[PDB]
Design a binder for this molecule. Structure first.
Ligand SMILES: Cc1cc2nc3c(=O)[nH]c(=O)nc-3n(C[C@H](O)[C@H](O)[C@H](O)COP(=O)(O)OP(=O)(O)OC[C@H]3O[C@@H](n4cnc5c(N)ncnc54)[C@H](O)[C@@H]3O)c2cc1C
Ligand SMILES: C[C@]12C=CC(=O)C=C1CC[C@@H]1[C@@H]2CC[C@]2(C)C(=O)CC[C@@H]12
Length: 523
């Protein structure tokens, strides 16, 4: 499947429009469905194309934490925060680079939240999760909001169409027993809201392949559904919110993107840069293709990874058996530090070192969560009764590994880490239950057996793609808009550059620029 552009005139020699809509949405992530809702709610006929047999993509896997600050939702919680406070935080991290999109992000958040909560299927609440950088306007508790838990019965036939959590989806399973939470709830509610409008068609196994141009304007796109090709006309526009290049090893190697397709937490085979490709084919510029939403990943027997988040013990060594980062860093800064320290394989993989404090468990949240016994049969993890035997089994220098652990244990006994300042930040302390020691993030590694887990450079999607303006319009290298073409989420180059400012920025940006694209199409 290549994403070459089809000219209207050339197609007129043979075929014709299968269907017509005002707004064609490609993808069914948080952005896609927010854009679809915005379009359909104000009377525009809308078609949503999902490539796979399940709506939601990585947005479904998410915890549905959303960085939409200064809204009616944080007002109800009485949060000491504002549009201007969130605007300062972004300015302090990102600078003047993309300041117009920074302004539009923070200024439009309130309207996106107000439009969505109006729908009986949608309600959010503030949930504490710290912002990720020391800077003016940081919220030590967070300012991010989450959809309310959703009883799958309230949405009928849509619950079985929603992609399940990673602990189910990569083991051939559907939703696990309780309610829909995190991204399952975000996608269930957005699907039900889009459907409530009576102006939207929701399609599974409908793949975008090529955009249709007349006289340089996008007028529609051919979508493959069940062996047959269809030609869908879009009177107002095509919103492309179909994710990034995360699943395409060839586009990543070409762009110089660190990590690997097989380490991405995107749904296997889903996000293969189809929409970025179709956008370049009609003259769209690209930026930041070497950038991803990075995270450490626990290497799996099958060669894939698990998102390692909320670290609360252990330490991490490079291939010399030495600490080189604060292991408690927010996952994107952790991942960037693995890549920066990588000297042809000294940091990728890294080795997470831990003891039996958690009964053999690795001291973090791993998504998905493979059983220790499985990692040990497979050799992704190794165990031993001594650090000397552990260094032997991993090929780590034994004397260095022993010094590293003895020095980390002295730091745990003292309650400060001289070397990397672990535990001296509200993000670091957030995940840690009280221990009987001075710093909750620093626990002496001394209760046998001892484990070494392989850590790789995973991602939560790439963040490079098509250049967009404040209204989600796709731009050519010259700054001019391609008429009828919008992109959002990881189809579009993030305003965040080399930064992951706080929880919910991927979904928050996606939802705001999808809303703004719909509004621009309404005219
Ligand atoms: C465990 C986990 C937790 C996370 N938690 C959060 C969080 O709380 N908040 C947050 O902001 N971010 C979070 N993230 C990151 C976030 O999920 C993603 O970066 C973000 O959702 C990307 O959304 P998207 O719209 O770019 O892509 P997706 O949500 O993946 O949507 C893309 C969709 O487009 C479809 N598609 C692809 N190609 C085509 C095509 N050719 N035609 C039609 N459809 C196509 C795909 O199948 C997919 O369904 C988390 C990630 C993970 C893995
Ligand atoms: C770190 C995270 C991810 C990316 C992002 O952007 C925002 C968040 C905050 C919410 C957590 C989520 C990851 C998954 C978590 C840990 C859960 O399973 C419950 C709360 C979720």
């Amino acid at each position: 499947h290549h994403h070459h552009s089809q000219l209207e005139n050339l197609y007129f020699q043979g075929s014709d429009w299968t269907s017509e809509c005002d707004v064609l949405v490609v993808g069914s992530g948080g952005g896609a469905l927010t854009g679809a809702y915005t379009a359909a709610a104000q009377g525009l006929t809308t078609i949503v194309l999902e490539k796979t047999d399940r709506f939601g993509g990585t947005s479904a896997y998410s915890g549905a934490s959303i960085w939409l600050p200064g809204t009616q939702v944080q007002e109800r919680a009485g949060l000491p925060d504002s549009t201007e406070n969130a605007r300062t935080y972004l300015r302090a991290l990102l600078g003047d680079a993309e300041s117009e999109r920074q302004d539009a992000y923070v200024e439009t958040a309130p309207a996106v939240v107000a439009l969505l909560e109006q729908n009986p299927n949608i309600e959010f609440e503030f949930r504490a999760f710290p912002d990720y950088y020391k800077a003016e306007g940081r919220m030590d508790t967070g300012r991010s909001i989450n959809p309310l838990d959703l009883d799958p019965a309230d949405i009928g036939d849509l619950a079985g169409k929603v992609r399940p959590e990673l602990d189910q989806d990569r083991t051939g399973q559907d939703h696990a027993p309780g309610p829909m939470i995190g991204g399952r709830a975000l996608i269930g509610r957005l699907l039900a809201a889009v459907q409530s409008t009576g102006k939207a068609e929701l399609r599974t196994e409908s793949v975008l392949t090529s955009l249709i141009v007349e006289d340089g304007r996008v007028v529609g796109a051919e979508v493959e559904s069940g062996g047959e090709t269809q030609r869908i006309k879009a009177n107002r526009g095509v919103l492309m919110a179909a994710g990034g290049i995360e699943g395409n090893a060839e586009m990543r190697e070409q762009a110089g993107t660190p990590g690997k397709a097989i380490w991405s937490m995107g749904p296997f085979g889903a996000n293969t840069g189809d929409a970025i490709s179709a956008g370049i084919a009609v003259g769209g510029a690209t930026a930041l293709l070497d950038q991803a939403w990075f995270c450490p990943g626990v290497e799996q027997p099958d060669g894939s990874a698990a998102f390692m988040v909320g670290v609360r013990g252990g330490l991490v060594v490079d291939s010399a058996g030495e600490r080189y980062l604060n292991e408690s860093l927010p996952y994107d800064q952790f991942g960037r530090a693995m890549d920066a320290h990588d000297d042809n394989g000294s940091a990728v993989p890294s080795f997470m070192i831990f003891d039996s404090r958690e009964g053999g468990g690795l001291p973090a949240i791993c998504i998905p969560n493979t059983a220790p016994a499985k990692h040990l049969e497979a050799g992704t993890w190794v165990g031993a009764d001594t650090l000397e035997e552990l260094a032997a089994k991993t090929g780590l220098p034994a004397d260095a590994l022993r010094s590293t652990v003895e020095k980390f244990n002295d730091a745990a006994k003292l309650g400060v880490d001289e070397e990397f300042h672990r535990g001296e930040d509200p993000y670091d302390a957030f995940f840690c239950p009280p221990n009987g020691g001075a710093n909750a993030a620093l626990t002496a590694i001394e209760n046998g057996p001892f484990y070494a887990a392989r850590i790789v450079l995973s991602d939560l999607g790439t963040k490079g793609g098509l250049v967009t303006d404040v209204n989600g319009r796709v731009l050519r290298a010259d700054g001019s808009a391609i008429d009828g073409l919008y992109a959002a989420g990881n189809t579009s180059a993030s305003l965040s550059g080399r930064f992951y400012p706080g929880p919910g920025v991927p979904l928050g940006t996606a939802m705001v620029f999808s809303y703004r694209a719909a509004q621009d199409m309404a005219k």
